[PDB]
Amino acid sequence: SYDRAITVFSPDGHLFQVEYAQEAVKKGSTAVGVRGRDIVVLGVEKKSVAKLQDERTVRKICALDDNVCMAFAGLTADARIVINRARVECQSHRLTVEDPVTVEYITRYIASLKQRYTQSNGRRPFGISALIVGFDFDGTPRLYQTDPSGTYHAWKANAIGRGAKSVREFLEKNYTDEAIETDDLTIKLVIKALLEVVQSGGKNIELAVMRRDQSLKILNPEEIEKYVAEIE
Amino acid sequence: GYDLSASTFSPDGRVFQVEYAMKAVENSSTAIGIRCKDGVVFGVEKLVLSKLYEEGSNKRLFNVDRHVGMAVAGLLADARSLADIAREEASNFRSNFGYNIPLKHLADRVAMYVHAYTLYSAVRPFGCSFMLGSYSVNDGAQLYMIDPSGVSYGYWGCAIGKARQAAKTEIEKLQMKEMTCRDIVKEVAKIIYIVHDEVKDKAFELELSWVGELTNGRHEIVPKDIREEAEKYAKESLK
Amino acid sequence: RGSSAGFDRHITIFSPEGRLYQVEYAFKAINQGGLTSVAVRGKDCAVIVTQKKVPDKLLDSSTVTHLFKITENIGCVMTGMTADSRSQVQRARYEAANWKYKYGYEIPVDMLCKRIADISQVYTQNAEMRPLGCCMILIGIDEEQGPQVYKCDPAGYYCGFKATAAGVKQTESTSFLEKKVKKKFDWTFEQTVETAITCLSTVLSIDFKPSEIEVGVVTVENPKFRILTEAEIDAHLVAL
Amino acid sequence: GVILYGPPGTGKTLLAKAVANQTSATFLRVVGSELIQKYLGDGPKLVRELFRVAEEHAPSIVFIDEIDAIGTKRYDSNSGGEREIQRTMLELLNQLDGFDSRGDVKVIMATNRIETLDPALIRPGRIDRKIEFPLPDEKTKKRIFQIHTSRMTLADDVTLDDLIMAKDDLSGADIKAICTEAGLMALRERRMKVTNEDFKKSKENVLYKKQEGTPEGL
Amino acid sequence: YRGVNTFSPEGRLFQVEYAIEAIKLGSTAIGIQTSEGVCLAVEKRITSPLMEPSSIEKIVEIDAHIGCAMSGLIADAKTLIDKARVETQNHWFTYNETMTVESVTQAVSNLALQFGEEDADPGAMSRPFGVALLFGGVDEKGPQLFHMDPSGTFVQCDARAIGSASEGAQSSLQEVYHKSMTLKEAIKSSLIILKQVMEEKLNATNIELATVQPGQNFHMFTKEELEEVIKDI
Amino acid sequence: SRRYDSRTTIFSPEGRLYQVEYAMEAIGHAGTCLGILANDGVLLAAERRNIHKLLDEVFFSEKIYKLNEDMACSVAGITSDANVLTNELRLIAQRYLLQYQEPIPCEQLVTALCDIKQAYTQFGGKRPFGVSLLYIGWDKHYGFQLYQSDPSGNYGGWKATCIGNNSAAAVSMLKQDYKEGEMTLKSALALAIKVLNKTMDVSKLSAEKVEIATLTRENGKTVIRVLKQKEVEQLIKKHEEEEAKAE
Amino acid sequence: NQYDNDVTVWSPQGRIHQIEYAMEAVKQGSATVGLKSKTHAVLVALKRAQSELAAHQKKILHVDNHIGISIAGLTADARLLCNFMRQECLDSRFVFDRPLPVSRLVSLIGSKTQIPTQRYGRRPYGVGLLIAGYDDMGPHIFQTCPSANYFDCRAMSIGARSQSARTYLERHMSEFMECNLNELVKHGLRALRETLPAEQDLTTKNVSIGIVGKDLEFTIYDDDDVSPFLEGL
Amino acid sequence: RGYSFSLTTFSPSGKLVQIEYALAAVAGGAPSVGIKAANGVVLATEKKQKSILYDERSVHKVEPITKHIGLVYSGMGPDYRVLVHRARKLAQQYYLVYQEPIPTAQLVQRVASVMQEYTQSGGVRPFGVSLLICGWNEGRPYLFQSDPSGAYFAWKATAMGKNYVNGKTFLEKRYNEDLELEDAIHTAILTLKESFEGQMTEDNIEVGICNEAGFRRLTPTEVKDYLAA
Numbered sequence A: 001s002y003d004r005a006i007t008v009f010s011p012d013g014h015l016f017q018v019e020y021a022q023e024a025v026k027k028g029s030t031a032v033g034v035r036g037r038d039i040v041v042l043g044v045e046k047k048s049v050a051k052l053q054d055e056r057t058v059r060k061i062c063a064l065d066d067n068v069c070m071a072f073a074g075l076t077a078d079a080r081i082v083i084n085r086a087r088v089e090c091q092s093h094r095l096t097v098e099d100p101v102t103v104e105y106i107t108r109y110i111a112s113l114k115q116r117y118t119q120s121n122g123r124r125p126f127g128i129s130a131l132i133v134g135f136d137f138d139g140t141p142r143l144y145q146t147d148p149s150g151t152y153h154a155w156k157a158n159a160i161g162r163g164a165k166s167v168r169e170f171l172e173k174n175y176t177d178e179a180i181e182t183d184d185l186t187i188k189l190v191i192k193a194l195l196e197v198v199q200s201g202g203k204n205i206e207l208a209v210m211r212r213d214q215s216l217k218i219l220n221p222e223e224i225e226k227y228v229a230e231i232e
Numbered sequence B: 001g002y003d004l005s006a007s008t009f010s011p012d013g014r015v016f017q018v019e020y021a022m023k024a025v026e027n028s029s030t031a032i033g034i035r036c037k038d039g040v041v042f043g044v045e046k047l048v049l050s051k052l053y054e055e056g057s058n059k060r061l062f063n064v065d066r067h068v069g070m071a072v073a074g075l076l077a078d079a080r081s082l083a084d085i086a087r088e089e090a091s092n093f094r095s096n097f098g099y100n101i102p103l104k105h106l107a108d109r110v111a112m113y114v115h116a117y118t119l120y121s122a123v124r125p126f127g128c129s130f131m132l133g134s135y136s137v138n139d140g141a142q143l144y145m146i147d148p149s150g151v152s153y154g155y156w157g158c159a160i161g162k163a164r165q166a167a168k169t170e171i172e173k174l175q176m177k178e179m180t181c182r183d184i185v186k187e188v189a190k191i192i193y194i195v196h197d198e199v200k201d202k203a204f205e206l207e208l209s210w211v212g213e214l215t216n217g218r219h220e221i222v223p224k225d226i227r228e229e230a231e232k233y234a235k236e237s238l239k
Numbered sequence C: 001r002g003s004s005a006g007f008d009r010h011i012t013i014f015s016p017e018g019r020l021y022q023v024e025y026a027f028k029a030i031n032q033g034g035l036t037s038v039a040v041r042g043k044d045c046a047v048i049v050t051q052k053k054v055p056d057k058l059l060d061s062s063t064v065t066h067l068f069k070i071t072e073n074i075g076c077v078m079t080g081m082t083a084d085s086r087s088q089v090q091r092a093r094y095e096a097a098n099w100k101y102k103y104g105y106e107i108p109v110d111m112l113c114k115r116i117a118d119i120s121q122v123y124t125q126n127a128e129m130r131p132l133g134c135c136m137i138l139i140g141i142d143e144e145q146g147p148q149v150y151k152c153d154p155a156g157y158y159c160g161f162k163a164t165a166a167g168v169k170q171t172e173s174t175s176f177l178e179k180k181v182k183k184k185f186d187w188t189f190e191q192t193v194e195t196a197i198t199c200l201s202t203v204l205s206i207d208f209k210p211s212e213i214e215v216g217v218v219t220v221e222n223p224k225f226r227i228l229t230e231a232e233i234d235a236h237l238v239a240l
Numbered sequence D: 001g002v003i004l005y006g007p008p009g010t011g012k013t014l015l016a017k018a019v020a021n022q023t024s025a026t027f028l029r030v031v032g033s034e035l036i037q038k039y040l041g042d043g044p045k046l047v048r049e050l051f052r053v054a055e056e057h058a059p060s061i062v063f064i065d066e067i068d069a070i071g072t073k074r075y076d077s078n079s080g081g082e083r084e085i086q087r088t089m090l091e092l093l094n095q096l097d098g099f100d101s102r103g104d105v106k107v108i109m110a111t112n113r114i115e116t117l118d119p120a121l122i123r124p125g126r127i128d129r130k131i132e133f134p135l136p137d138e139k140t141k142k143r144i145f146q147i148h149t150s151r152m153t154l155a156d157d158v159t160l161d162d163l164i165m166a167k168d169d170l171s172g173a174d175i176k177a178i179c180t181e182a183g184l185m186a187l188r189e190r191r192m193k194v195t196n197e198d199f200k201k202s203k204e205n206v207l208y209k210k211q212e213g214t215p216e217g218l
Numbered sequence E: 001y002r003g004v005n006t007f008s009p010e011g012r013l014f015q016v017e018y019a020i021e022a023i024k025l026g027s028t029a030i031g032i033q034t035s036e037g038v039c040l041a042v043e044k045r046i047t048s049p050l051m052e053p054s055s056i057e058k059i060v061e062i063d064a065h066i067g068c069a070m071s072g073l074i075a076d077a078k079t080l081i082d083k084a085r086v087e088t089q090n091h092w093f094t095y096n097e098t099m100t101v102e103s104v105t106q107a108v109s110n111l112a113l114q115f116g117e118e119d120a121d122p123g124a125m126s127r128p129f130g131v132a133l134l135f136g137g138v139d140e141k142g143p144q145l146f147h148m149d150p151s152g153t154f155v156q157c158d159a160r161a162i163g164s165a166s167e168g169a170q171s172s173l174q175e176v177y178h179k180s181m182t183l184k185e186a187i188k189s190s191l192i193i194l195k196q197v198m199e200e201k202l203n204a205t206n207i208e209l210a211t212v213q214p215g216q217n218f219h220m221f222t223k224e225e226l227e228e229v230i231k232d233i
Numbered sequence F: 001s002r003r004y005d006s007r008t009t010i011f012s013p014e015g016r017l018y019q020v021e022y023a024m025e026a027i028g029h030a031g032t033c034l035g036i037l038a039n040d041g042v043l044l045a046a047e048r049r050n051i052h053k054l055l056d057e058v059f060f061s062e063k064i065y066k067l068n069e070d071m072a073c074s075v076a077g078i079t080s081d082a083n084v085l086t087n088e089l090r091l092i093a094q095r096y097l098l099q100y101q102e103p104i105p106c107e108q109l110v111t112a113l114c115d116i117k118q119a120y121t122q123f124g125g126k127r128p129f130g131v132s133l134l135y136i137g138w139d140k141h142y143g144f145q146l147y148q149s150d151p152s153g154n155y156g157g158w159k160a161t162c163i164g165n166n167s168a169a170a171v172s173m174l175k176q177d178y179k180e181g182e183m184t185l186k187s188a189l190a191l192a193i194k195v196l197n198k199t200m201d202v203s204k205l206s207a208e209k210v211e212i213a214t215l216t217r218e219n220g221k222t223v224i225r226v227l228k229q230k231e232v233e234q235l236i237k238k239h240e241e242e243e244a245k246a247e
Numbered sequence G: 001n002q003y004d005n006d007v008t009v010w011s012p013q014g015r016i017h018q019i020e021y022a023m024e025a026v027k028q029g030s031a032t033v034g035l036k037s038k039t040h041a042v043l044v045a046l047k048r049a050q051s052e053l054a055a056h057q058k059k060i061l062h063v064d065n066h067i068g069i070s071i072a073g074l075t076a077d078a079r080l081l082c083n084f085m086r087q088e089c090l091d092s093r094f095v096f097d098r099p100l101p102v103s104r105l106v107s108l109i110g111s112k113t114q115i116p117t118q119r120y121g122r123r124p125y126g127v128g129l130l131i132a133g134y135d136d137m138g139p140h141i142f143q144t145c146p147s148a149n150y151f152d153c154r155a156m157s158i159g160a161r162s163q164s165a166r167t168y169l170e171r172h173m174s175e176f177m178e179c180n181l182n183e184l185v186k187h188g189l190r191a192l193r194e195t196l197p198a199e200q201d202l203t204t205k206n207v208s209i210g211i212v213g214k215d216l217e218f219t220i221y222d223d224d225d226v227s228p229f230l231e232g233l
Numbered sequence H: 001r002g003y004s005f006s007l008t009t010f011s012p013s014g015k016l017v018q019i020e021y022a023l024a025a026v027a028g029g030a031p032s033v034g035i036k037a038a039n040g041v042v043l044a045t046e047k048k049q050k051s052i053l054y055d056e057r058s059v060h061k062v063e064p065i066t067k068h069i070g071l072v073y074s075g076m077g078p079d080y081r082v083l084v085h086r087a088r089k090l091a092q093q094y095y096l097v098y099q100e101p102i103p104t105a106q107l108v109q110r111v112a113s114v115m116q117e118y119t120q121s122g123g124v125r126p127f128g129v130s131l132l133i134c135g136w137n138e139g140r141p142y143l144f145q146s147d148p149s150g151a152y153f154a155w156k157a158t159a160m161g162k163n164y165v166n167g168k169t170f171l172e173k174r175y176n177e178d179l180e181l182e183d184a185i186h187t188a189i190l191t192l193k194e195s196f197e198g199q200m201t202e203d204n205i206e207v208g209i210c211n212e213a214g215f216r217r218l219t220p221t222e223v224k225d226y227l228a229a
């Protein structure tokens, strides 16, 4: 077995592999997230239709459990690996505890897996950052973000990926109780914020919305364009 | 960069790490073995680094079996590991074939074990050379040596250590063929004193041993009285 | 011609010119002993002769040697590094014993050489370890093939020969022997022992004494490999 | 000294050229690869002279462009002519701020890649000011476009914004390339005027020089 | 080049020294030991308003009578906490007693430094943990405060400060603390030193505080309880 | 030993896997591959590089591979890594079939293989596989399909694609001349002949420096075929005739 | 430069540098001493504290009822070696219902420390012990260095500044065999005092004493328990 | 333990360089030839020993795998021995499972797949050999080549080793699909002769054939007879 130490400490105390992982994370399409009174919404940026890709095989917001979803920004293969692992653990939780999984539990699990690959032998750290959203059984809205170092926090509105600093500044200046009162106001807020990096919109965005019991909501292009117009 | 591992030959066909390890063995003091009609005699110069050590600190003669002795020079950690390996070989031989290991076979097995440490990058050559010597009614007196390269060759007289050349020029004069261990002992002390350098090193206490017809084939430390008389004769000879 | 790309001179990997430099150096180490050997194939006898250097009068001359028996019938010369030579001789003895255990009859010379050369080929493919710096020559009688003379080298080459030399003086001895084999038959009697001794004496320019060489023989009448004693060697030495 | 750093094609050399042709001193320009000399001890001589005929000439400015080729991180585990590179770097490092007083001279520098410079070269007393150079965002693109399209007869269907609106991360040198290529194909077709269709086709053609692995890294 | 398990010409494992450097990136945490109890104070360091301050679990309880405060990396602690807790529970299972503080510190210390590259495990640890912990709790022997470092070196301390501002914080803690403090006075002095170090102005939202006393189990200070202490603070 | 280690699985200082980048750089020199999904078929059009008068004709093809009864794939990169990946794909298909008694859906399969490849580029110390794949198949979930893979482990559904030499040019025409949802199998084959004729700038389609595949549903079951010489040459004659009439 | 990166790479002078750097790590630690008389063996140690509020690090541990050690270097290595020694002593009692002779324990220690210094990627034990024991052959003192090389000493002093201590020991070696327990302990304390840096005196806060003898299990004196020994110097 | 990292790695131009060097070694060996007649398949190489002291019969380069399929090489010797052994073992495993003689296409696939593993595995270097295999399976001749990269090619007629480019030109001149076995072996003997540097004695070349009767080496007297012409 290959048993070399890929990630190793450096003078001044830096995990250069971890730093390069997040440098990779900075080469991915911007993903955004906001938290409202009773709706969470995930927003991504599609690179380009290209008129020949099948957007069904390219999805970038995925569901881990019926009540939990996630969006990533970085490399794709690593994202696929983490998503499958999280799915397995959600189902194992359901089988053993007989109660629905909670957002913090799965975020903790994913962060632990990232830390493990950051401290094991012969393993390259994941260059992906995640945004987990959902509602626990109590019906409380939640938003967590996981970095490639294995660190996680909870947020009201964070943007991950390319151009994250700009979108984070926008959300930080704008996030106020007024913008979460109406679910439409929140969806439109996310659409507007994204609209500070992407160009076209409508045909250059994806949206996701989730409610208390309502399953994952994928907004169709026509409805998204209508939402942007109503914003217009 | 041709001398960083034992898994690389020099452009002229040499394994350097082995050469360096064998260089190390020339920083340790001098040891001597002389074969005679009755048996073998080992004598080692043990340097006293500090006044605070006990007598007998780091003895440099070992017993790998009840009939075999073992003199060493170089890294002592390697010497003790190889002593352990020779003991294991002897015990295994006795348990398997039901009798005391012939000394040649022990020399071969130990040398193969050392040589296997001079092929790979994952390990490094032993920094010790050593000499085995036993005696039996059948096989008679024997004295062998194995160097870091793993070469085993029989000897009528040899000196492994710092002042190896001076002793070698000295051991060549005995005519050991036609004496017994009792006089070989005085000779061994005589040499170990002739080779010792009082300008560089401070002082030493001898370690002497033998195996021969006088032991019934048992290797054992030379008794105190004989050792003292030998030391005294060597002192007188160094007028 | 002599390019280097990376570690091609440190581990057994190819050079830009398809060359394994580590194997080549290993071949270069066969000469580090300073000895030479010759083997000659006769009509009913096969002979191997070798030098015997007693560096001084403290060694036990009976122990320093380079002749060994693999089986009671197959005997070999070892040249080059001594420790590597011992290792290869042990492996050969084990292999022959296993052949007789498994297949019920003594091992042919050629097949033993093949097994040993395969071992060396594994040594020259994997890069963790280094090729051994020793070469073999084997001799014995085959049932229906006559006397056999075979050699092997670090790279894994196991050609069978009519008369061979290995060591520092490989080329001069090989030239002499090629000329002889050209002359009539490359010696065609048990006095092939004289041709080998002459070749060594000429190449090294030595004028041997009784106590400066060691011989081994195998005869069709006496297949068991025999290690010529000092009296017989002196007799042959006087003969010429 | 001022070090101009930023992504390639963003206005460093141009701004130095401008502050040169506008001021009243003797402005000198050098390429870093032009200090890599094929005889030993010639690079240090060149730098020493360059800073020698700058005090002979009253107020003076020096602009060492593409310095990255000469000042690098200074990794020690290197062999060859890199040692000479480091030795010329030491000569420069002394000239900028060393034992003697530099007189009346200023030093500008450029580097597309700056994370790889030596800490002692760009340290405070050697280079006090350090300038980032971002790409044009949305409107500087319009400005540059109208700057380079300035001298050419264009058809009255030129949807310039349509070319600018796309967030293709265009660079200033890319804008110049687009202008020139469009003008050249307009010449090819004999047409007395340049058409919007030509500009969009030229844009597609210039961007065609991007390449790379698409899914990888994203 | 330069394996993980390598000795500098001074006699220091390089990886250990670099791990000790990473503890300066971490926020500043304090601990004070008094006869009436032991207290832990740390700085949450809210980067941006947009994140829930409650979601920075930077003090956790090992057992009802132990407490832990950390500085360094978020991710590196998690495994050390789990080890400490499973060891405490293991001891309770076997001996039906309460795991002492020095013993849990020792077990956590052993778990550190068992890192390497050659012949260890299919997935053993590679680099040393880059986190400095603070265990404080009440044992059969009374209030205790222990300090751990990436070198597997632990020592019981009367007052310690770990983190980006550990120096200066330590001079303050040394000038103030005496052998006869009171728990509440300890909370006050700790909160004051923290206020003195943080860049931001202290508020109940951007700190956490915990005390453990002989009677009450490990206690987390609540937002209102935090305000109550900070107002007079 | 760290001295000789290559570190084929470690990040660079800008978060890009170099061995992966070079692997994708190898593909851009092997034969071109083309994908076109029709409304009634799928088709692979790669170039036959083994163009010598002294090579022999063997097997039903030279670059197209069957994987199930209802799936086939073509390769660009190294031939030997190609063989290794093809074998593992066949094994995956049969393992799914054994567990479920249903043919493996297409994205089932493509993601299983890409997971192997990704894992291979994540840990282990080996070099990555220098192969990029094009697949074709039918399953009751999405009908006729056309996927693609890369040394990284990323895949993608493509209505039309090109992986290999002159990929930029081929995808450029494929963008210019693709009718999304308005393509018969015959039209797709003609478009393939045209695009390839462009790309294989060396001479013109010799009907022998090319490989074509078709996957269709016939009589309720999939049918896979590799176009013979006569039909290919007839198609090329039709193409030249159409271009001549056009001029 | 390239001969001091791995432990398996002989240097062209017949020296392995990593082993020497490990020796350095052992020499940078705090001072310690060992003695043997005809009746007892006494270890005397000098703990030191990182700050003025932290405790002084323990540096004498128990192995068996008839053996004791005193460490100097990286603690984690010392803890590992203590684990090994204690397991060996327990196994000897379980199998043979008898105390393990000291010499044999030191031999096993040497052999265990030998394996690291001959395999690629492993590193020498960066700790220096001073084992004191009492077997059927009577009192013993041994020393262990990172190179797997143990010494049968009658008195020694490892650690930082230990050379003045060694000088005093070699100065009075004649009396040690005839001394009472009190005089022996006073010799050890006096030497370890020769090690102290001028304006620093022996106190109850920076000394620990260990003793083993004919009818006396190994016992550790520390804190105020050491005052009876110190009072008299 | 053993190195667990690949020693062949991609270069910036996307080329596995070690494989290129192995190919260089192959191109620097002894010549070899193979033709596929209408009713047989012929291999032939050159075995010019270095002196009169080498037993021509001691070793052979054209070696069979089963009664009906055999192979020759050009490159390094010991690697050829290893690959001969592996091929014989794989053939016997196929026979044991299926109780039928192994087809040549499959044996070539299997030996080549064994050849790929050493391009990617850890701590090993590529084989410095190319083989040609001949078989008579399904009443039909087969000629395959296998190189260090693990790639195989079906050949109508080929020539590898030193001066292989000129040999391929020759064979391109002299192939005629309606060829007969004796003419094919004659043409081969010639191709080796196109560059040989000496007189082709019976004891300086080898040949092996395959037909319905079975793959079988040619005895030297047979070789001399064929060389008569």
Ligand SMILES: Nc1ncnc2c1ncn2[C@@H]1O[C@H](COP(=O)(O)OP(=O)(O)OP(=O)(O)O)[C@@H](O)[C@H]1O
Pocket: D007, D008, D009, D010, D011, D012, D013, D014, D015, D110, D111, D112, D144, D147, D171, D172, D173, D176
């Ligand atoms: N804002 C701008 N105004 C005018 N011209 C511009 C602008 N930005 C870029 N350019 C064009 O960029 C061209 C490139 O020259 P310039 O001096 O800007 O290069 P640079 O940024 O120094 O490049 P490099 O990083 O390769 O050294 C100039 O000819 C100028 O035409």
Ligand SMILES: [Mg+2]
Pocket: D007, D008, D009, D010, D011, D012, D013, D112
């Ligand atoms: Mg510029």
